[PDB]
From a paper:
Recently, a shortened Dscam (sDscam) gene family with tandemly arrayed 5′ cassettes in Chelicerata species has been identified, which encodes ∼50–100 isoforms. Chelicerata sDscams could be classified into two subfamilies, sDscamα and sDscamβ, containing one and two variable Ig domains, respectively. Crystal structures and cell aggregation assays demonstrated that both α and β subfamilies of sDscam used Ig1 for the isoform-specific trans recognition in a hand-in-hand manner. Furthermore, the cis interactions were established by the three FNIII domains of sDscam, which assemble into a cross fold with a kink between FNIII2 and FNIII3.
We found that FNIII2 alone but not FNIII1 or FNIII3 could promote cKIT tyrosine phosphorylation, suggesting the essential role of FNIII2 domain in mediating sDscam cis interactions. The gel-filtration analysis supported our observations in the crystal structures: Ig1 mediated the formation of trans homodimer and all the three FNIII domains were involved in the cis interactions.
Residue numbers in the entry: 387 to 491
The structure:
Amino acid sequence: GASAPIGAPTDVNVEPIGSRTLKVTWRPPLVDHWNGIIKGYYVGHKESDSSQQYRYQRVERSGINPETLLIAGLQKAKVYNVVVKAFNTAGSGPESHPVEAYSLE
């Protein structure tokens, strides 16, 4: 039946931009991985040395490439990593490999 995309978003980058904010950018999964229409993404992040689950934010697909998300309100002097997955109507696909960045002032 209907199922989620079968590949991860691509070219994920994470840039510290100061004020405890990270700038996350990424591109869609390979077109042949979409298994339908991409409706949006979930961006997950956590502290690199935490055994907690990733914390996620849902973002709608924009008409722009790459996609961009600012993650602000982070803690001082900690290091984070970020993952992204795409979703279609059915569900969310696999996640990108984490990309790491420090929350810088």
